[PDB]
Structure formats: structure tokens, C-alpha cells
Design a protein around this ligand. Sequence first.
Ligand SMILES: O=C(O)c1cccnc1C(=O)O
Ligand SMILES: O=C(O)c1cccnc1C(=O)O
Lengths: 284, 284
Amino acid sequence: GLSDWELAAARAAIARGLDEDLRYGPDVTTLATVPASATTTASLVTREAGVVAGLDVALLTLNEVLGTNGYRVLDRVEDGARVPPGEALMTLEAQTRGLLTAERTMLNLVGHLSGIATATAAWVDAVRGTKAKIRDTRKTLPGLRALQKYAVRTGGGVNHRLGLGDAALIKDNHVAAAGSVVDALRAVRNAAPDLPCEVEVDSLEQLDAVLPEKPELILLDNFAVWQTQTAVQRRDSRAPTVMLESSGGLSLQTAATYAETGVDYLAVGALTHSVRVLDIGLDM
Amino acid sequence: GLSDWELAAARAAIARGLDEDLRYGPDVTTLATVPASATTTASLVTREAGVVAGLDVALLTLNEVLGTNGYRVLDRVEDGARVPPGEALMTLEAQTRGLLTAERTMLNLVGHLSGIATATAAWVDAVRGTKAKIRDTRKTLPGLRALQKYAVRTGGGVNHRLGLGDAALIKDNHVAAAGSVVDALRAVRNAAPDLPCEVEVDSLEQLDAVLPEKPELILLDNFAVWQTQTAVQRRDSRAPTVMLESSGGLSLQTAATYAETGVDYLAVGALTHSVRVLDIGLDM
Ligand SMILES: O=C(O)c1cccnc1C(=O)O
Ligand SMILES: O=C(O)c1cccnc1C(=O)O
């Protein structure tokens, strides 16, 4: 479910969402059309198929708008559930005004997160029968990292680092600064020897240069499938304990091809940047 | 450029972005590889074509990380510029450590906002030769509405309402609550007779019923092209002053056909939910 940190990230997001909606005044239109005493049974229903994620975030939105004792959940599906088109994700009974005010914020969050989990489950199916795991990146939206990371996990992927001090990842700009891949690698080993280290290589030459150093992980940056295969062959013979992760020109159509080379992971930025919403509506 | 509200939204976003990155500890890898005294000229360069938006947000991230006197902008492109693949959006000279730490948050913001401006510009080209304007919706991400709304405007779109009290919009759930389309419309007229009112109809029957009431705008919910043409013909004959807006089963491939019917606007939720990042890198 949501973690302590994820829950707090969630409340903060629902709080910013509601404030964007209410900043210009109250919900004049629902105030004018529905009485305070109104109550309904409404359903979060999908207009399309996908994997559901972020259903608790819906409940948190209601808590914020209606208060915990302001609604009742008659039925609900579990996050991670693969779902067909007119499926009712959650049925609840609540004061109508509260629902109509919470609606857009609530729908926007779960449609976004379900979008993420739906995509990641696609990648996960793509590399099935391979040892490869799908991983995310730090290409997340400011303020939503904890929720986006949660959604990929829900769709079956595995999280990469959550931030900069979380783990080390020597990139092209460090190698440049350090003047060398090995230089950079050594430098970070000396500075934070307790920290996981990933080194990013963009060529087979660099790959040969760092394999002996035995870093935890090497990220193959934009390798062609034939280069990824060579990379795997070199690693298997020289440093069996080093893990390989592809990142770069990955597409869902090519994902199995790369996976088949034997790499350990596929790092997919699109899982978090470039997400397509799962279309969900609130039906009363 | 950015307004006071967009500026504050931007600062709030960059602040959330950086905290996500630094929450676990400092940037160990750049601290270990690049000296405090280091300085470079770096460029924000696109890996693909599109429309640029959010460059100011890049400068704001540096202000936050390097301080105003921590960097120098040698060159920059203007927001709204149509840009080719290897184009340099902005070239600057700054302390290297500051750049590497600001990088991901900076790239994530401008890449997102450029993806939005890029897409809205495609719709705008699509309905070119028509009087139709591309508008957005409230289907925005929590905490990013002001920026996303700014971006569609940059791409050539026009913003719809910013929140719930901004303007009235009678939706299906209000119609259900009010029992009738006409009931609902009347109710809001009585309650906020000064505020802008848009009424959403999902049938020509409903359309016929509200046309006489003369609302400011009528949102045609999921009308087929032929129904949109009829709607425009009836509006032109019965209530010339009523403005029509298509929202629903709109696709970039169908955009011009709908625009040609004569509607005044096309409300596109995809512009802000479902956005694909404009790929941009920081080259040193
Ligand atoms: O920083 C990361 O963890 C990361 C890991 C794999 C691929 N990309 C990234 C990135 O955001 O640049
Ligand atoms: O509420 C709005 O502003 C709105 C306006 C046009 C289309 N959709 C919406 C929506 O978010 O439901």
C-alpha cells in the first residue's frame, strides 16, 4: 500500500490539487445546484481497460473534502487489478456536494497513476520469459515522485534510486568532469564506499575499461541490440557479478529484443515522463 | 514571461523537485568528481523538434541552486520558438556542481512544459483556417496547473477556467443532482448571475432545451461531426450569441473536421493529461 512517505506525498498532492480548484472562490455551480443535505452512491468507473493504481489516493481526497465519517465505501477493487472497460473501481455513498468538489482532483490523480501502472505492466509483459526487470528513472514530475514510483511498482516494475544521495550513478557529465570513467568510479568508491554505485557507459570501449573495476551496475546508454549482446557476453566472461541495465533507445516494440540479450534491467523513462491517462469517470 | 502567479507556482514546483532529489543526502557523485571551483559553459539542447516553453523555469532553478550571481546566460531562445533537433535552447556559464545538481529538476520541468506547448501547437496547426481556438481543461496534474495552463497558451492555445469558482460549468453530475439541464442552468443563473456560465449537453435534445435559455457557452459532450454541424446550424438560427465548444471524442486526426463545422472552440484534455515529454538534454 502507500508508505508513510507516500501517504504524506499523497496528502500534499491532494492539498495542492484542491487549492488549485478552490483558489478563485467556492464551487459556485454545485452550491447552486445541489443542497447540503444531498447524498448519492457514485462509482469510479473506467472508460477503458488497464491496471488500476492510486485508489487510496481517492479515499484520501474524500477524507480531505468530506472528512473520514463523510462517506462510506460500499465496494472497491484492489490497486494492481487488471481491469476491463466499464469496471466499477469503487462504489461509495457520500454527501453529493463533497463528491462534485473532490471529483476532478481525485480522478486526475488515479487516472495519472493508473496510466503509469498500466504502461509499466505492458513493459513487464513484453519482457516476460526473460530475467529482465523494468525500472524507473528520476525523470518524474516535481512533487509527484513518490506517487509515480508507487505506480510503477503497482504495475510490476521495480524502483531505481529515489534521489541523488540515494545511490550513486556516474553519468556522462561526471566522467567528463572526472576526466575518466575509471577516475570517476574510483573517486566515488573512495568517497562513499558504503553506497551503491552505477556507472553509465556509452561505448564498448568504456565498458571494457570499467568491467575490471567491478561496479555494482553499468547502465548501457543507447546501445544497439548488437552492442547490448556483446556487452552481456563480455560481462558474463569477465565480471559475472556486474549487473547490466539498458537505458536509452527503448521502445515497447523493441523491449523483448533487448531483454533477450540477457540484460538485467531495462530502465524506462517514459514510464514517468510521457504518461497517458487511464480514462476514468465518476458516475452517479 | 511568467506572471507573479506562474512565477510562484514555478518556485514552488522547483522547490518540491529539489527536495525530492536531496531528501536522501547530498549529490555524492558530483561532490566526489567535480571540484567546487569548477565552471563550464553548458547548453540545454533538444534531442527532437518541437515548441519550447518553460525556459524561465530553468533560470529559476539555477537561482535557487547557484544564486543569481552564480551563473551567466550567454544565449537563449524565446519561449514559443519552433525548434529543430539539435537546437541549443540556452547556453550558459556556471559553476559545474550547481549545474549537475539542478539538471534533472530543470530538464523535467522544461521537457514537460515543452511537450505540452508542442502538442497544443499541433492542434492549432490542425484547425488552422478555421475560427476555432484550442482550449484546455481542468484535467491538469496536482500542483502543476498554472505551469500547464501557461504552456498551452505558449503553444498557441487559450486557457479555459483555472478553477471551480472562476466560472460556472454545469456538468452531467449537476444535471443529475438538479434533475434537469434547464433546472440546473436556471439555478446557477439565480445564484451567480454575474459569473460566466457554460452548460454541458450530451444530446441535441438537451441542446434544444437550453438554447432558448441563452447560456454563455454550451459544451458539446462527445458529439459526432454530423451532430456538431447540426448544433452549429441550430445555434446560428436560434441563439446567435451562444458560443459552442466541442469536448469529448476529439483526436488530432479529427480536429479539422470538427473545426470546419464552425464551432468556436475545441476543449482538449489530452493537452495536459497524457503529455509526452519534449526530449532535452544538458550538454557540457
Ligand atoms: O538517475 C537515475 O536513477 C536514472 C536511472 C536510469 C536511467 N535514467 C536515470 C535518469 O533519470 O537520468
Ligand atoms: O471543468 C473544466 O474546466 C473543464 C472544461 C472543459 C472540459 N473539461 C473540463 C473538465 O476538466 O472536466
